[PDB]
Design a protein around this motif. Structure first.
Motif, PDB file in Angstrom:
ATOM      1  N   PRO A 205      81.983  18.807  53.256  1.00  7.97           N
ATOM      2  CA  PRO A 205      80.767  19.234  52.650  1.00  7.97           C
ATOM      3  C   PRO A 205      80.743  19.947  51.331  1.00  7.97           C
ATOM      4  O   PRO A 205      79.675  19.557  50.660  1.00  7.97           O
ATOM      5  CB  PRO A 205      80.102  20.474  53.545  1.00  7.97           C
ATOM      6  CG  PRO A 205      80.498  19.316  55.317  1.00  7.97           C
ATOM      7  CD  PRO A 205      81.785  19.138  54.694  1.00  7.97           C
ATOM      8  N   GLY A 206      81.355  21.245  51.529  1.00  6.03           N
ATOM      9  CA  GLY A 206      81.450  21.977  49.921  1.00  6.03           C
ATOM     10  C   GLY A 206      82.756  21.500  49.076  1.00  6.03           C
ATOM     11  O   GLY A 206      82.559  21.519  48.732  1.00  6.03           O
ATOM     12  N   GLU A 207      82.990  20.512  49.115  1.00  8.43           N
ATOM     13  CA  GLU A 207      84.285  19.316  48.115  1.00  8.43           C
ATOM     14  C   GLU A 207      83.245  19.044  46.867  1.00  8.43           C
ATOM     15  O   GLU A 207      82.520  17.429  47.574  1.00  8.43           O
ATOM     16  CB  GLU A 207      85.138  18.616  48.897  1.00  8.43           C
ATOM     17  CG  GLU A 207      85.812  17.680  48.229  1.00  8.43           C
ATOM     18  CD  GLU A 207      86.432  19.634  47.290  1.00  8.43           C
ATOM     19  OE1 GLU A 207      87.640  19.621  47.709  1.00  8.43           O
ATOM     20  OE2 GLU A 207      86.776  20.089  45.881  1.00  8.43           O
ATOM     21  N   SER A 208      83.038  18.915  46.147  1.00  8.79           N
ATOM     22  CA  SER A 208      82.791  18.117  44.327  1.00  8.79           C
ATOM     23  C   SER A 208      83.580  17.085  44.395  1.00  8.79           C
ATOM     24  O   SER A 208      83.080  16.809  42.677  1.00  8.79           O
ATOM     25  CB  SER A 208      81.846  19.005  44.379  1.00  8.79           C
ATOM     26  OG  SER A 208      82.200  19.626  43.559  1.00  8.79           O
ATOM     27  N   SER A 209      84.702  17.892  43.996  1.00  7.81           N
ATOM     28  CA  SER A 209      86.080  17.091  43.498  1.00  7.81           C
ATOM     29  C   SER A 209      86.749  15.531  43.903  1.00  7.81           C
ATOM     30  O   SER A 209      87.432  16.254  45.121  1.00  7.81           O
ATOM     31  CB  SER A 209      86.683  18.326  42.984  1.00  7.81           C
ATOM     32  OG  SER A 209      88.056  17.830  41.431  1.00  7.81           O
ATOM     33  N   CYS A 210      87.791  15.090  42.899  1.00  6.20           N
ATOM     34  CA  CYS A 210      88.365  14.154  43.357  1.00  6.20           C
ATOM     35  C   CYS A 210      89.679  14.314  42.477  1.00  6.20           C
ATOM     36  O   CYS A 210      88.933  14.896  41.723  1.00  6.20           O
ATOM     37  CB  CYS A 210      87.655  12.467  43.359  1.00  6.20           C
ATOM     38  SG  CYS A 210      86.246  11.652  44.521  1.00  6.20           S
ATOM     39  N   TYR A 211      90.361  13.936  43.061  1.00  8.59           N
ATOM     40  CA  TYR A 211      91.692  14.128  42.352  1.00  8.59           C
ATOM     41  C   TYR A 211      92.631  12.808  42.237  1.00  8.59           C
ATOM     42  O   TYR A 211      92.793  12.143  42.959  1.00  8.59           O
ATOM     43  CB  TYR A 211      92.788  15.596  42.785  1.00  8.59           C
ATOM     44  CG  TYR A 211      93.346  14.549  43.928  1.00  8.59           C
ATOM     45  CD1 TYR A 211      94.897  14.308  43.703  1.00  8.59           C
ATOM     46  CD2 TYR A 211      92.830  15.242  44.966  1.00  8.59           C
ATOM     47  CE1 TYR A 211      95.270  14.371  44.883  1.00  8.59           C
ATOM     48  CE2 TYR A 211      93.690  15.499  46.510  1.00  8.59           C
ATOM     49  CZ  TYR A 211      94.809  14.977  45.896  1.00  8.59           C
ATOM     50  OH  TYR A 211      95.773  14.365  47.281  1.00  8.59           O
ATOM     51  N   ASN A 212      93.508  12.898  41.197  1.00  9.60           N
ATOM     52  CA  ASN A 212      94.374  11.383  40.622  1.00  9.60           C
ATOM     53  C   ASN A 212      95.906  12.313  40.079  1.00  9.60           C
ATOM     54  O   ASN A 212      96.017  12.964  39.280  1.00  9.60           O
ATOM     55  CB  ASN A 212      93.950  10.461  39.789  1.00  9.60           C
ATOM     56  CG  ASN A 212      94.674   9.150  39.478  1.00  9.60           C
ATOM     57  OD1 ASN A 212      95.756   9.933  38.877  1.00  9.60           O
ATOM     58  ND2 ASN A 212      93.905   7.887  40.266  1.00  9.60           N
ATOM     59  N   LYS A 213      96.759  12.063  41.253  1.00  5.11           N
ATOM     60  CA  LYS A 213      97.958  12.786  41.115  1.00  5.11           C
ATOM     61  C   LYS A 213      99.456  11.400  40.320  1.00  5.11           C
ATOM     62  O   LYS A 213      99.162  10.659  41.441  1.00  5.11           O
ATOM     63  CB  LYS A 213      98.403  13.889  41.663  1.00  5.11           C
ATOM     64  CG  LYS A 213      99.440  14.952  42.029  1.00  5.11           C
ATOM     65  CD  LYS A 213      99.764  15.377  43.457  1.00  5.11           C
ATOM     66  CE  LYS A 213     100.827  15.680  43.073  1.00  5.11           C
ATOM     67  NZ  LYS A 213     101.086  16.044  45.007  1.00  5.11           N
ATOM     68  N   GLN A 214     100.080  11.726  39.564  1.00 10.06           N
ATOM     69  CA  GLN A 214     101.135  10.281  39.040  1.00 10.06           C
ATOM     70  C   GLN A 214     102.513  11.221  38.534  1.00 10.06           C
ATOM     71  O   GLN A 214     102.305  12.306  38.556  1.00 10.06           O
ATOM     72  CB  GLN A 214     100.375  10.031  38.029  1.00 10.06           C
ATOM     73  CG  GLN A 214      99.167   9.022  38.494  1.00 10.06           C
ATOM     74  CD  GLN A 214      99.219   8.532  37.279  1.00 10.06           C
ATOM     75  OE1 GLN A 214      99.199   8.040  36.399  1.00 10.06           O
ATOM     76  NE2 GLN A 214      97.231   7.883  37.304  1.00 10.06           N
ATOM     77  N   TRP A 215     103.407  11.108  39.389  1.00  6.77           N
ATOM     78  CA  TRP A 215     104.473  10.878  39.393  1.00  6.77           C
ATOM     79  C   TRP A 215     105.379   9.871  39.700  1.00  6.77           C
ATOM     80  O   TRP A 215     104.899   8.346  39.249  1.00  6.77           O
ATOM     81  CB  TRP A 215     104.911  12.481  39.931  1.00  6.77           C
ATOM     82  CG  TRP A 215     105.282  11.467  41.760  1.00  6.77           C
ATOM     83  CD1 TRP A 215     106.288  11.314  42.136  1.00  6.77           C
ATOM     84  CD2 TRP A 215     104.208  11.724  42.216  1.00  6.77           C
ATOM     85  NE1 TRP A 215     105.925  10.903  43.507  1.00  6.77           N
ATOM     86  CE2 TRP A 215     105.179  11.502  43.536  1.00  6.77           C
ATOM     87  CE3 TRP A 215     102.737  12.369  42.381  1.00  6.77           C
ATOM     88  CZ2 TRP A 215     103.968  11.522  44.773  1.00  6.77           C
ATOM     89  CZ3 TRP A 215     101.992  12.144  43.571  1.00  6.77           C
ATOM     90  CH2 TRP A 215     102.782  11.819  44.759  1.00  6.77           C
TER      91      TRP A 215
END
Lengths: 62, 62
Positions: B19-29
């Motif tokens: 519910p309180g999450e508004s971000s998405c992430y993309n992590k690369q290595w």
């Protein structure tokens, strides 16, 4: 930190961010002109409906 | 918020964030297999060298 600061599909240009700044941003929205893309240093606030992405590496915001 | 949570080039899948999450992430290595991409909800802290981008709109982290 170096970030792209060119608009939409214009030729790539960059901006050397102020010391301490580690983020770049890519702001996107669409109107009559189509999809507009604004890029720069930092991670600013945006109006609802505007797509914002921030990243933390060199010229990561194309 | 709905975010992609599939790895690298696997078929796109999503995760409905808390519910309180508004971000998405993309992590690369990189590893022996090539460039690896992790995707999910939130905006995690990553070790130096790891490319991270966080965005604030539906399924914005492809």
């Amino acid at each position: 930190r170096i970030c792209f600061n060119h608009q939409t599909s214009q030729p790539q240009t960059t901006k050397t961010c102020s010391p301490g700044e580690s983020s770049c941003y890519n702001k996107q929205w669409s109107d009559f002109r189509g999809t507009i893309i604004e890029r720069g240093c930092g991670c600013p606030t945006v109006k609802p409906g505007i797509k914002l992405s921030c990243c933390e590496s060199e010229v990561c915001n194309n």
